[PDB]
Amino acid sequence: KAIASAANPIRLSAFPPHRCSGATTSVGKVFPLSVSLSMSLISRASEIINMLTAISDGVYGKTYLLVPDDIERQEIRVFEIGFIKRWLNDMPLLQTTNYMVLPENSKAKVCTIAVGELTLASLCVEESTVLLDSQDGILVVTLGIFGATPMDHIEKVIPVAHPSMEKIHITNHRGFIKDSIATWMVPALASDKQEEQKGCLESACQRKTYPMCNQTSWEPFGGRQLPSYGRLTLPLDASVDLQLNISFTYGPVILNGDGMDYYESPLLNSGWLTIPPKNGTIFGLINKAGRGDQFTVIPQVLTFAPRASSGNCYLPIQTSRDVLIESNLVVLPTQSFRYVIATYDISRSDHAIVYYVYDPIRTISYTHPFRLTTKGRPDFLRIECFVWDDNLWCHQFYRFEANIANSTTSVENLVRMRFSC
Amino acid sequence: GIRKAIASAANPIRLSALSGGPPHRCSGATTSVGKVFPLSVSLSMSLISRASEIINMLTAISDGVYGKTYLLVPDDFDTQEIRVFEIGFIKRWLNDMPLLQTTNYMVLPENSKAKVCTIAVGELTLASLCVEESTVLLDHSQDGILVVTLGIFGATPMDHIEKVIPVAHPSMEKIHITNHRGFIKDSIATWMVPALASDKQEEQKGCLESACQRKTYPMCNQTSWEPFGGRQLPSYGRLTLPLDASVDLQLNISFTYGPVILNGDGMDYYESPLLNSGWLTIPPKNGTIFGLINKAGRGDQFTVIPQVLTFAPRACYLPIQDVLIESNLVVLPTQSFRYVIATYDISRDHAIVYYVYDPIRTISYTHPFRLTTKGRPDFLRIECFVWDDNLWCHQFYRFEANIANSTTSVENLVRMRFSC
Ligand SMILES: *[C@@H]1O[C@H](CO)[C@@H](O)[C@H](O)[C@H]1NC(C)=O
Ligand SMILES: *[C@@H]1O[C@H](CO)[C@@H](O)[C@H](O)[C@H]1NC(C)=O
């Protein structure tokens, strides 16, 4: 049934910037049409919380929390998967083909998201901090592209971690599925090389002050415990039951533990481990992350995480605006290296969702704002971008509370950006 | 999983079986409580949400699978209007509400002249017959019909877009395809349409003339009957389409005379508890020229025999002669024979009031749905089903507002409960 439900949608499985400088003109468009469960719920004024979306090979997959309408049988975990079909005017139309709801006893307050090979993968936990280490387990959730299939799984798995990791911090994490293997990246904590790396970092703050070497509480885990990079591997082989291998490695200093996405890379058995910016002081990060046997995290852009002149550590480059929320880091599925970040900007007469597309090799950055008829200030912003007909498309979902209203509004739509002279 | 048909059948027949499951009189007044369920993951509902106009949406519901066909007017030679097909499930949402989720859809280009298309669903498949002109000739552009088949998911051998020349009985002359719901059973899609034939005409001219020989009806001065305008009465035509891939597609057309047909603008066909049979219903017409329900054979024998809503003058049958529009007589998918019809009533707010007739107990329930909007209607279409032993109806209507210039389309699910 797997290969039959795979032969059916291959029919449905069918450069952005300017090559030179000068004046840059950016034209944007919002495409509102969508056959998605999430957008239908948003139209009926239902409240969607923390929608994480992953797009890969023409298949899309969302996970989010639904706030019900006087119903408790207090939030509901929902998974959604479908296609990106070509609508009239060659517009990308997201059509849901399968979805699934969890009851509250599977406790899925925090869930990851990944799509690929007509499958949706998600790791769910009630508390964000998982101990490694009464054994703390993770809820593995897999959903097929269509109907009820052996592809579907709802199991509680005990992770197989390296000795010795202590914790991981699961918040908002996009992974991806390739070679029938789902991979995520999360902030981790381990005993190995902990004092050595704080020692190398402290020997780095003897030559240059950073807003971290006096910090008594580092980001993901309270106290002065340095976070590492954790790699969550989940095979989708049916030969044996599901097991979650967790690896760890030190890389650039992690200053944001509230998000760590992972995008596929043109290099085989490698990927882009990205960390979003926060508070206006923590820069975003892009790292080369290995997904094979050896797990190595090495920076791609060398100016937001340069290596220290002495030792095996990196420099925690930080900063001592009218952007309220900003997230996340999306590496575009292009052969040329480009990444995107969207901000909720209030510097103009109207509020705007302003996209920044960085080409860091040539040190150029394009920008385009999407002006909002509504006004208010957001608590969440999430982008997932893809290329469609030589154009940059982004699925954006943001959640904001209005200045004049009492309730919190959720917004979700597709946007396109073109860049010319 | 060697064949996609049975693999794409093992996955959703578990989900089409999710739908599993009218009191005994009442002392005094009988209370009916209604509800509108607006949530839907349907392409048609999404298009309506962006104020795009959907025209002539025919919907068929069967075994937990739904299927729509309609015309979409976009905003980008003749018109242009776009034929759209849609098929999906009725999944159980929170609070056990019926949620229509599209699982596959398809759009036709304009070299397929598909202005008029029938609709039928069953066995995880959507079947449709398409023509530009409603009148198809079967005589001597040699009239073919566009067979359109759509699978439950993705691109499958179930999908077909072929233009077939119908194989009719000798000799039928015409059929009139407008708004016709059929259904798919035993890998056969069946529709019923008004037909025209040479044979055995004298029997019904004699019964027809003998009906007004005691009482005048606005029918015995008629020198021209409706669908084909000629001086010969239309008959009942049965369009049979096998969906087996064992043989290439062939459109079998049979015909039989039954109760006198006075309305050629619609003829729907619902499944019946009787083996190899179904319920052929004909919609009402303005005034009180009402619709009729007949038992129609679906096997080797094609017989159309009146069930309700036709009287007998001499000892054939004839139909009975503030509601602005009304079409579509729907037989409920129950073991007991019950049928539904909803009207656009303006006697009150405006309302869509459903009438559910249970003739065995000689009882009829009614319920109005008051409209927040006001205006005058151009189209009304209902398709009803049972969900948790409750009466649900998918309704789509098209009306022109007092305040606008263009016509607005509305589509939603309604439920009706009856209590004491
Ligand atoms: C993770 O550990 C398990 C158990 O040894 C193994 O099956 C799996 O291959 C490991 N993953 C990697 C990437 O080494
Ligand atoms: C359809 O027509 C062909 C030839 O007239 C015949 O072999 C077949 O039995 C017919 N089937 C039905 C259901 O009418």
Numbering used by the authors:
A (entry chain A): 161 to 174, 183 to 241, 246 to 305, 311 to 497, 502 to 602
B (entry chain B): 158 to 178, 184 to 238, 243 to 306, 311 to 485, 490 to 495, 503 to 529, 531 to 602
Passage from the reporting paper:
CDV is an enveloped virus with a non-segmented, negative-strand RNA genome that is classified in the genus Morbillivirus of the family Paramyxoviridae, to which the measles virus (MeV) also belongs. CDV has the attachment glycoprotein hemagglutinin (CDV-H) at the virus surface, which utilizes signaling lymphocyte activation molecule (SLAM) and nectin cell adhesion molecule 4 (Nectin-4) as specific entry receptors. CDV-H consists of an N-terminal cytoplasmic tail, transmembrane region, stalk region, and C-terminal head domain. With regard to viral entry events, there exist proposed models in which a conformational change of the H protein induced by SLAM or Nectin-4 binding causes a structural change in the fusion (F) protein at the virus surface, leading to fusion of the virus envelope and the plasma membrane.
To determine the structure of the vaccine strain CDV-H by X-ray crystallography, the expression plasmid encoding soluble CDV-H head domain was transfected into HEK293S GnTI− cells, which lack N-acetylglucosaminyltransferase I (GnTI) activity to modify glycosylation with homologous oligomannose-type sugars (Man5GlcNAc2) and was purified. The molecular weight of the non-reducing soluble CDV-H determined by gel filtration chromatography and sodium dodecyl sulfate–polyacrylamide gel electrophoresis (SDS–PAGE) matched its dimer form, indicating that the head domain of CDV-H exists as a disulfide-linked homodimer. We determined the crystal structure of CDV-H refined at 3.2 Å resolution by molecular replacement using the MeV-H structure, which shares approximately 30% sequence identity in the head domain with CDV-H as a search probe. There are two CDV-H monomers (chains A and B) in the asymmetric unit of the crystals, which have only slight differences (root mean square deviation = 0.301 Å) in the structures of some loops. Therefore, hereafter, we focus on chain A as a representative structure of CDV-H, in which a more extensive electron density is observed than that in chain B. The head domains of CDV-H of vaccine strain exhibit a six-bladed β-propeller structure, which is essentially the same as recent cryo-EM structure of wild-type CDV-H ectodomain (r.m.s.d. = 0.584–0.743 Å), similar to that of the MeV-H structures. Furthermore, CDV-H forms a homodimer structure facing the β-propeller 2, α1 and α2 helices, resulting in a dimer orientation inclined to the horizontal plane, similar to the MeV-H homodimer structures and distinct from other paramyxoviruses, such as parainfluenza virus 5. The interactions at the homodimer interface are mainly composed of three parts: the top, middle, and bottom sections, as shown in Figure 3A. The CDV-H structure, which contains five N-linked sugars exhibits electron density only for Asn422-linked GlcNAc.
